[PDB]
């Protein structure tokens, strides 16, 4: 019933590990379909070969800008941006997968994986999934980031797709 | 607008009704003239974008000018967005996010966000940027409201030199051009468009004569 | 209206007379125009429902408009009662009971209850709700006082383009049917009703033309 | 067009002559009316870019509309190439090179390459992208064929209300300016242009009146 | 529409162009007859809401009737939301999607969501609900298209009983009423409005006589 997608992560081309995500399509369906479809690449464009452009140790890893590769772009499968579906789920801990945005109703394709409890984000970013397998791969990724987000090595989504 | 409050902590103080009444009166009698831009800058010192929006909404009439101002504000916002891109992502707990192109115009930015952007260290000059945009718009409007061009200013046969130079300098100030061009424009147009007798009187003084000598020449 | 003190807390303050005088003067002198709503919103910032009932009852003349506003406030109060139903059962020790649709207006509640509602923990913005209702009523009033519809606008052969666009945008701001429909109207109806000569001068610039070039085309 | 097999896989299939005949006949008989886009989207589900270029080149007559569609497809392909630059160098063995705008259009690529793109892992929807572009072009074409504007609608003294509303909604569906603007138009312009007798019969029901009672009022 | 595919696994099969052509032809040739409802219900067996939207968009002309149909679909969706709101309850162990008024009407529901709601166990009858709504709308339309009232059906002086009863039963089927009202009307109105020459014949047979007895009585 709820889809599961994976990401094979790479640090400058060396394979690092697989993170897999359960998308809560039963509560945030339109948000979950957009991450699912961008992971499969079935609509022609997507996450494969994009990188995490902003990694802040102890906060979150952000990625998903496949058009401009630096947080200023990305687009959804419904057009460039769409509404905040709802705020049922909250940022309760590491592994929560939440939507990045540029204020309300500006969701595109950027997402962030929390590596800590970030309750201040509640009510401001739609949560739509959580890490299933691979959280120590997300944790190891932190080491390649910095206080301001700049990463030291290129961290890419080498491959991604749907598992179930 | 925010103001330094005893002691050393800026707190938000809403715009006073007397300031709004003064603004409505100056946009009722002075209407649109060169002096309105300086009056506006003095009535809205350190004003949050909400206060400037309030001061621009209270103007009754002249809807074309207000629409020009709104469109130029939108154009400046688009240019600021094209020059200062805003990266998406979660904000830091200590510092505030970089304001977008429309967060300056107070359209989608709540008052608390603006107060934060102003009182934070380092401060974000949202108020001064929006004031620069409104001042560009007001310059456009006052250069549009000019009845005649500066090239059309000519003195009447018996019209005294006083009224002629007053009207000429008023139209020149209302006109929009670089100061370097004005330096040639004055020395080329002031003496030429005068009355023939006063024309010869000023030419007897010399080409580089100052304004006071040129005046006291034809005085009376 | 409540006012903050040096320690930061707020307490009721008697309404200033030259606020009531200014409101009565602006209501009578300017009658009803789109620029009465910003003045009203600026005059009564933080005013209690008693102060708003004062500022409304004090308006002598134009009693039909005041009755329209009363009816609009009446319907709005009924909707608030219908949307939220009071809960039953035991109440928490740190919390106490809320006001009704009619008490938001302040018709059947004393001033001390309004002050307690406004300075409670957490504060309840009854003043802002009643101000929103009054602003909606004033919008409907200024809609009624519109002297024409948006479609009937047709510029005369001699009426200058400036006066035409002024009248257009005046009755457009007085229309307030929507915001995107306004954006479509300013593209279509503005270009569709020009005088033939200046009409084809505007058509020479195509639909991409902005308002500034639109007016300086017909200018001079 | 691709078609799934018994075991679930899909492979290219020759275009049926019945589809082409039906498309050409509906284009000839129904000209360019709002009901060609749904039938076009239904006829060519899963069709390759070669099949769409066939269905477009096969349309004899109305060559101006086909040229408009070609220009729109060209602009969309240029924007796609600008937003998605293609990489150079050797291509991976398990991946086929990504198509450019002119190749998304299917102008400079073989049918086998289209089939490989459509049946790749993951599949690349070139057919759906080019179908979206053709649908946008057809929307622009049906906009161009629109005989009259939406504002010029006025019912004659004898023209029945049924024919009036038929013509109104026909040109309204042919307008396609927006959705909320259409919703505002069907509230205002529909009742604003009725014949005086039936006009006041509709005004007797107020703005809350729906279309059914709007019609059965003037009925009989 | 989805169809049982070998073996036992329903997969989505797009609507065939021949079905759409048959629908367009039956709406062109037969206009809006009482029989279209059965033809529509039989042409779209088990159709996804997208297929019914396609079949309602492919219609040519009769835009007023399509507007009544859309408005009644909206009303049914509104009532459906009102009759099926989410009341607080313990969450089910198993979660299945849910169709909203807008999710049933195929407006904001993607094809995959509808396929899910249909093929899931237990199935959600979105297709049958939307078909009931469209059938109610078509009943409204065909009862509106009635040229004359059933009460006005009267036989001509030499009009044979054949054509008289044919037209009478056709208008009665187009008319809307409960079955008992029709049972009373066929006994009170049919014999009375007949031609007196054969009216005497029908009266001679008896009040509770069947249709075939009267028909063979006035035969010839």
UniProtKB/Swiss-Prot annotation, chain A:
Tell me the impact of changing residue 124 to R.
Loss of acetylation and interaction with TARDBP
Q: How is its activity regulated?
A: Binds cyclosporin A (CsA). CsA mediates some of its effects via an inhibitory action on PPIase.
User: Mutating residue 106 to A: effect?
Assistant: No effect on peptidyl-prolyl cis-trans isomerase activity. Reduced interaction with BSG/CD147 and ability to induce leukocyte chemotaxis
How does this protein assemble? Interacts with protein phosphatase PPP3CA/calcineurin A. Interacts with PRPF19 isoform 2 (via N-terminus). Interacts with isoform 2 of BSG/CD147. Interacts with FOXO1; the interaction promotes FOXO1 dephosphorylation, nuclear accumulation and transcriptional activity. Interacts with integrin ITGA2B:ITGB3; the interaction is ROS and peptidyl-prolyl cis-trans isomerase (PPIase) activity-dependent and is increased in the presence of thrombin. Interacts with MAP3K5. (Microbial infection) Interacts with HIV-1 capsid protein.
* Protein's UniProt name: Peptidyl-prolyl cis-trans isomerase A
Q: Which residues carry this modification: Phosphothreonine?
A: 92
Modified residue N-acetylvaline is at which positions?
1
> What family classification does the UniProt entry report for this protein?
Belongs to the cyclophilin-type PPIase family. PPIase A subfamily.
Q: Cross-referenced Pfam families, in alphabetical order?
A: Pro_isomerase (PF00160)
What post-translational modification does the entry describe? Acetylation at Lys-124 markedly inhibits catalysis of cis to trans isomerization and stabilizes cis rather than trans forms of the HIV-1 capsid. PPIA acetylation also antagonizes the immunosuppressive effects of cyclosporine by inhibiting the sequential steps of cyclosporine binding and calcineurin inhibition. Acetylation at Lys-124 favors its interaction with TARDBP.
Q: Which organism is it from?
A: Homo sapiens
Query: N6-acetyllysine-modified residues are where?
Result: 27, 43, 75, 81, 124, 130, 132
Q: Name the major location.
A: cytoplasm
Looking at its record, which EC class is this enzyme? Answer: isomerase
What changing residue 59 to A does, per the record, is:
Loss of ability to stimulate MAPK/ERK phosphorylation
Functional note? Catalyzes the cis-trans isomerization of proline imidic peptide bonds in oligopeptides. Exerts a strong chemotactic effect on leukocytes partly through activation of one of its membrane receptors BSG/CD147, initiating a signaling cascade that culminates in MAPK/ERK activation. Activates endothelial cells (ECs) in a pro-inflammatory manner by stimulating activation of NF-kappa-B and ERK, JNK and p38 MAP-kinases and by inducing expression of adhesion molecules including SELE and VCAM1.
| E.C. no | 5.2.1.8
Q: Where in the cell is it found?
A: Cytoplasm; Secreted; Nucleus
Q: Which reaction does it catalyse?
A: [protein]-peptidylproline (omega=180) = [protein]-peptidylproline (omega=0)
Modified sites of kind Phosphoserine: 76
* UniProtKB keywords: Acetylation, Apoptosis, Cytoplasm, Glycoprotein, Host-virus interaction, Isomerase, Isopeptide bond, Nucleus, Phosphoprotein, Rotamase, Secreted, Ubl conjugation
Upper taxonomic classification of the species?
Answer: Eukaryota, Metazoa, Chordata, Craniata, Vertebrata
One Gene Ontology BP term is: viral release from host cell
Where is the Glycyl lysine isopeptide (Lys-Gly) (interchain with G-Cter in SUMO2) crosslink found in the sequence? 27, 81
> What residues does the PPIase cyclophilin-type domain cover?
6-162
Curated annotation (Swiss-Prot), chains B, C, D, E:
- Region Dimerization/Multimerization of capsid protein p24, residue ranges: 145-220
Task: Quote the PTM field.
Answer: Phosphorylated possibly by host MAPK1; this phosphorylation is necessary for Pin1-mediated virion uncoating.
Cellular location(s) = Virion
Indicate the annotated site residue(s) for Cis/trans isomerization of proline peptide bond: 89-90
The ranges of region (Interaction with human PPIA/CYPA and NUP153) come to 57-95
Subunit field text: Homodimer; the homodimer further multimerizes as homohexamers or homopentamers. Interacts with human PPIA/CYPA; This interaction stabilizes the capsid. Interacts with human NUP153. Interacts with host PDZD8; this interaction stabilizes the capsid. Interacts with monkey TRIM5; this interaction destabilizes the capsid.
Briefly, what is this protein's role?
A: Forms the conical core that encapsulates the genomic RNA-nucleocapsid complex in the virion. Most core are conical, with only 7% tubular. The core is constituted by capsid protein hexamer subunits. The core is disassembled soon after virion entry. Host restriction factors such as TRIM5-alpha or TRIMCyp bind retroviral capsids and cause premature capsid disassembly, leading to blocks in reverse transcription. Capsid restriction by TRIM5 is one of the factors which restricts HIV-1 to the human species. Host PIN1 apparently facilitates the virion uncoating.
The name this protein carries in UniProt is Capsid protein p24
């Amino acid at each position: 019933v709820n889809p599961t997608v994976f990401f094979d992560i790479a640090v400058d081309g060396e394979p690092l590990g697989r993170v897999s995500f359960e998308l809560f399509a039963d509560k945030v369906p339109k948000t979950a379909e957009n991450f699912r479809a961008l992971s499969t690449g079935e609509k022609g464009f997507g996450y494969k070969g994009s990188c995490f452009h902003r990694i802040i140790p102890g906060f979150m890893c952000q990625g998903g800008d496949f058009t401009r590769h630096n947080g200023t772009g990305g687009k959804s499968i419904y057009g460039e941006k769409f509404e905040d579906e709802n705020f049922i789920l909250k940022h309760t801990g590491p592994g929560i997968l939440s939507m990045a945005n540029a204020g309300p109703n500006t969701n595109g394709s950027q997402f962030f994986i929390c590596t800590a409890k970030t309750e201040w984000l509640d009510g401001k970013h739609v949560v739509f999934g959580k890490v299933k397998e691979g959280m120590n791969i997300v944790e190891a990724m932190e080491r390649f980031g910095s206080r301001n987000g700049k990463t030291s090595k290129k961290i890419t989504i080498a491959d991604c797709g749907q598992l179930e | 607008p925010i103001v330094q409050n005893i002691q050393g902590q800026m707190v938000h103080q809403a715009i006073s009704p007397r300031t709004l009444n003064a603004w409505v009166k100056v946009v009722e009698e002075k209407a649109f003239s060169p002096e309105v831009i300086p009056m506006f800058s003095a009535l809205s010192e350190g004003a949050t974008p909400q206060d400037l929006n309030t001061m621009l909404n209270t103007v009754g009439g002249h809807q074309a000018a207000m629409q020009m101002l709104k469109e130029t504000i939108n154009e400046e916002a688009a240019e600021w967005d094209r020059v200062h891109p805003v990266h998406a992502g979660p904000i830091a707990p200590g510092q505030m996010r970089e304001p977008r192109g429309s967060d300056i115009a107070g359209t989608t930015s709540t008052l608390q966000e603006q107060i934060g952007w102003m009182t934070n260290n380092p401060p974000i000059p949202v108020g001064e940027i929006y004031k620069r945009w409104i001042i560009l718009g007001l310059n456009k409007i006052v250069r549009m409201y000019s009845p005649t061009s500066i090239l059309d200013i000519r003195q009447g046969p018996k019209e005294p030199f006083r009224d002629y130079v007053d009207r000429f300098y008023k139209t020149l100030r209302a006109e929009q051009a670089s100061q370097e061009v004005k330096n040639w424009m004055t020395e080329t147009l002031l003496v030429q468009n005068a009355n023939p007798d006063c024309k010869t009187i000023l030419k007897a003084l010399g080409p580089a004569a100052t304004l006071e000598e040129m005046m006291t020449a034809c005085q009376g």
